[PDB]
Design an enzyme around this catalytic site. Structure first.
Site, PDB file in Angstrom:
ATOM      1  N   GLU A  51       0.790   8.188   1.579  1.00  0.00           N
ATOM      2  CA  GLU A  51       0.070   9.030   2.355  1.00  0.00           C
ATOM      3  C   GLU A  51       0.433   9.371   3.907  1.00  0.00           C
ATOM      4  O   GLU A  51      -0.467  10.004   4.642  1.00  0.00           O
ATOM      5  CB  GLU A  51      -1.466   8.286   2.480  1.00  0.00           C
ATOM      6  CG  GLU A  51      -1.336   6.913   2.976  1.00  0.00           C
ATOM      7  CD  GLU A  51      -2.637   6.066   3.232  1.00  0.00           C
ATOM      8  OE1 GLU A  51      -3.683   6.589   2.538  1.00  0.00           O
ATOM      9  OE2 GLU A  51      -2.735   5.088   4.047  1.00  0.00           O
ATOM     10  N   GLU A 106      12.043   3.375   7.782  1.00  0.00           N
ATOM     11  CA  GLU A 106      11.047   2.481   7.295  1.00  0.00           C
ATOM     12  C   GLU A 106      11.396   1.802   5.936  1.00  0.00           C
ATOM     13  O   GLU A 106      11.205   0.655   5.499  1.00  0.00           O
ATOM     14  CB  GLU A 106       9.710   2.900   7.369  1.00  0.00           C
ATOM     15  CG  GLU A 106       8.571   2.254   6.715  1.00  0.00           C
ATOM     16  CD  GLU A 106       7.337   3.215   6.709  1.00  0.00           C
ATOM     17  OE1 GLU A 106       6.230   2.626   6.567  1.00  0.00           O
ATOM     18  OE2 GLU A 106       7.462   4.595   6.487  1.00  0.00           O
ATOM     19  N   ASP A 133       0.748  -1.340  -0.007  1.00  0.00           N
ATOM     20  CA  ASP A 133       0.095   0.122   0.101  1.00  0.00           C
ATOM     21  C   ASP A 133       0.866   1.276   0.290  1.00  0.00           C
ATOM     22  O   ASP A 133       1.371   1.537   1.106  1.00  0.00           O
ATOM     23  CB  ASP A 133      -1.033  -0.111   1.254  1.00  0.00           C
ATOM     24  CG  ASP A 133      -0.370  -0.139   2.431  1.00  0.00           C
ATOM     25  OD1 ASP A 133       0.329  -1.230   2.603  1.00  0.00           O
ATOM     26  OD2 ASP A 133      -0.428   0.742   3.233  1.00  0.00           O
TER      27      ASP A 133
HETATM   28  O1  LIG Z   1       5.239  -1.303   9.018  1.00  0.00           O
HETATM   29  C1  LIG Z   1       3.986  -1.595   9.181  1.00  0.00           C
HETATM   30  C2  LIG Z   1       3.193  -1.380   7.693  1.00  0.00           C
HETATM   31  C3  LIG Z   1       2.803   0.070   7.197  1.00  0.00           C
HETATM   32  C4  LIG Z   1       2.370   0.238   5.980  1.00  0.00           C
HETATM   33  N1  LIG Z   1       0.867  -0.181   6.042  1.00  0.00           N
HETATM   34  C5  LIG Z   1      -0.049   0.106   7.102  1.00  0.00           C
HETATM   35  C6  LIG Z   1      -0.422   1.625   7.106  1.00  0.00           C
HETATM   36  C7  LIG Z   1      -1.910   1.896   6.350  1.00  0.00           C
HETATM   37  C8  LIG Z   1      -2.292   3.275   6.923  1.00  0.00           C
HETATM   38  O2  LIG Z   1      -1.366   4.225   6.445  1.00  0.00           O
HETATM   39  C9  LIG Z   1      -2.857   0.768   6.632  1.00  0.00           C
HETATM   40  O3  LIG Z   1      -4.117   1.249   6.204  1.00  0.00           O
HETATM   41  C10 LIG Z   1      -2.191  -0.677   6.173  1.00  0.00           C
HETATM   42  O4  LIG Z   1      -3.385  -1.543   6.550  1.00  0.00           O
HETATM   43  C11 LIG Z   1      -1.090  -0.970   7.233  1.00  0.00           C
HETATM   44  O5  LIG Z   1      -0.609  -2.104   6.798  1.00  0.00           O
HETATM   45  C12 LIG Z   1       3.133  -0.748   4.923  1.00  0.00           C
HETATM   46  O6  LIG Z   1       2.722  -0.480   3.628  1.00  0.00           O
HETATM   47  C13 LIG Z   1       3.046  -2.205   5.384  1.00  0.00           C
HETATM   48  O7  LIG Z   1       3.683  -3.193   4.292  1.00  0.00           O
HETATM   49  C14 LIG Z   1       3.724  -2.460   6.607  1.00  0.00           C
HETATM   50  O8  LIG Z   1       3.359  -3.697   7.155  1.00  0.00           O
END
Ligand SMILES: OCC1=C[C@H](N[C@H]2C[C@H](CO)[C@@H](O)[C@H](O)[C@H]2O)[C@H](O)[C@@H](O)[C@@H]1O
Length: 500
Positions: free
Chosen positions: A464, A449, A265
């Site tokens: 975002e 990250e 995402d």
């Molecule tokens: O490090 C945690 C994470 C955050 C990021 N995504 C999260 C944040 C989103 C909101 O900004 C959320 O909707 C998504 O389900 C979450 O897994 C990233 O892209 C993931 O691959 C990752 O697991």
């Protein structure tokens, strides 16, 4: 547990839309001081009165949220949380054991992050924490029927890339087959979630996370059970759907959530137009990484069953795994381009784009040897950059795209390449990414990250939310790689300027 948009109904919509907080995840993680039904009755009374202040109503009713090696080891306690009990109406879901969170705004456990974090923990001899995390994930499987995206009520309608069987295999590296046999019931339970709907599925049809192609081939896709805005990104998702009137909004919401279930995402990987998120269509794309993981899960399930003494079951899982491998080789290889790729259910063909997901068949040992050599070539030619492995070749403005390098993809690619003796490319990826991690650490005194791979020393961006610090899977993957690039005779506490 009900997600906050359902639990807090009209008020949640209004607080998010008012943008009282700079992050949409803030109010999603807020705890009601009293029964929601009561706060809602109260709000309905006050909301239209002269001089009603929404912000004040919310404050009153809710509680709102050294060497490289030394630095990582000292971070583990900072990233560790223990929440066996939770307040009433908290979005945070309880877990029996302590767990490591990624960092920053991510104040809950994540599914696929935890595998790469656990790699670091295992490498540091924190096998107790690794046991605790497997136990946490087993508990979620038994409690919810699957592993949610994270331990939040607004993550219950989806999963993430399925690494649980791999986590159990990690634990077995320390505890032997006893760990495989212990967690066999939960592995089967997770498998039944991924396969739910296969029964009565006809050729050319999809149901939830299962896709059956026209010739009968069974494969999986990412899917979320809900088709509404994500509570944690409420105004973003509404704006995205509003910007594309030619699609039903529910379809856009479904694909936004499903890209979130994918871990990627967001990414040009899912989009018709790489500059418009409102064109993403995750639910009509059969992902090559997911299906590589499903293959691995079936291979691990066969191994666990056989260890457990259930030979009929071991043979069934092996047969399922053999069929999946034939599907990956047929539908998830782009023969015109010479790389693995996703399959498009709209056009009924293999998609064109090269992404880092194309290394997953190597990572799980599904790939033919000649295709693995082709992948080493594609990697050197297109994806390998001065600061690590590029996610894609496309700069979309999204985070799972060029020029970002993500730790989990560096690890999957190097392990995948090594599985086929492609040691040179594997070492270049590790060395480039580690140099980037070390350089950024020399500069900022932190791990982040994701990284910009076009150079070294800067963190990535896009998407975002701002770049986050910590950071679970970066720390975990860094330790793992650090331990491998230097001999055991002389281990390194920083990434060196010369390869030994
Ligand atoms: O490090 C945690 C994470 C955050 C990021 N995504 C999260 C944040 C989103 C909101 O900004 C959320 O909707 C998504 O389900 C979450 O897994 C990233 O892209 C993931 O691959 C990752 O697991």
């Amino acid at each position: 547990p009900q997600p906050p948009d359902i639990l807090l109904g009209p008020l949640f919509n209004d607080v998010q839309n008012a943008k009282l907080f700079p992050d949409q995840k803030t109010f999603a993680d807020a705890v009601p001081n009293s029964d929601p039904l009561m706060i809602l009755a109260d709000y309905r009374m006050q909301q239209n009165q002269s001089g009603f202040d929404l912000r004040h109503f919310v404050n009153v009713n809710f509680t709102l949220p050294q060497s490289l090696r030394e630095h990582i080891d000292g971070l583990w306690p900072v990233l560790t949380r223990s929440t066996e009990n939770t307040e009433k109406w908290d979005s945070l879901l309880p877990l029996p054991e302590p767990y490591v969170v990624p960092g920053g705004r991510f104040r809950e456990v994540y599914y696929w992050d935890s595998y790469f974090t656990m790699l670091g923990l295992a490498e540091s001899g924190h096998w107790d924490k690794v046991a605790d995390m497997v136990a946490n994930f087993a508990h979620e499987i038994d409690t919810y029927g699957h592993i949610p995206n994270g331990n939040r009520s607004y993550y219950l309608s989806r999963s993430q890339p399925p690494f649980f069987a791999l986590m159990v295999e990690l634990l077995a590296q320390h505890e032997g087959d006893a760990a495989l046999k212990q967690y066999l019931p939960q592995m089967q339970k997770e498998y039944a979630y991924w396969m739910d709907g296969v029964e009565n599925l006809q050729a050319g049809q999809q149901e939830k996370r299962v896709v059956k192609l026209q010739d009968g081939t069974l494969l999986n896709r990412y899917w979320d059970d809900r088709d509404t805005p994500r509570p944690e990104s409420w105004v973003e998702d509404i704006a995205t759907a509003k910007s594309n009137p030619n699609r039903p909004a529910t379809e856009i919401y479904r694909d936004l959530r499903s890209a979130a279930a994918s871990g990627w995402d967001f990414s040009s990987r899912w989009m018709d137009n790489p500059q418009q998120l409102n064109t993403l269509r995750t639910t009509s794309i059969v992902p090559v990484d997911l299906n590589s993981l499903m293959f691995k899960m079936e291979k691990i399930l066969a191994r666990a069953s056989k260890a457990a003494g259930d030979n009929a079951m071991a043979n069934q899982y092996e047969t399922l795994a053999n069929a999946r491998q034939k599907g990956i080789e047929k539908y998830l290889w782009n023969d015109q381009q010479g790389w693995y790729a996703d399959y498009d259910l709209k056009s009924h063909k293999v998609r064109n784009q090269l992404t880092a997901a194309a290394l997953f068949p190597l990572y799980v040992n599904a790939a033919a040897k000649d295709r693995a050599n082709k992948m080493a070539t594609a990697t050197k030619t297109h994806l390998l950059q001065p600061g690590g492995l590029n996610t894609t070749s496309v700069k979309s403005g999204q985070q799972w795209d060029a020029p970002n390098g993500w730790a989990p993809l560096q690890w999957v690619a190097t392990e995948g390449l090594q599985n086929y003796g492609q040691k040179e490319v594997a070492m270049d990826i590790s060395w480039h990414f580690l140099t980037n991690v070390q350089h950024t650490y020399d500069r900022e005194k932190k791990l982040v990250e994701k990284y910009d791979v076009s150079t070294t020393g800067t963190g990535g961006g896009g998407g975002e939310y701002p770049l986050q610090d910590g950071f679970g899977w970066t720390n975990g993957v860094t330790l793992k790689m650090l331990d491998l690039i230097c001999p055991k005779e002389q281990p390194c506490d920083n990434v060196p300027a010369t390869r030994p």
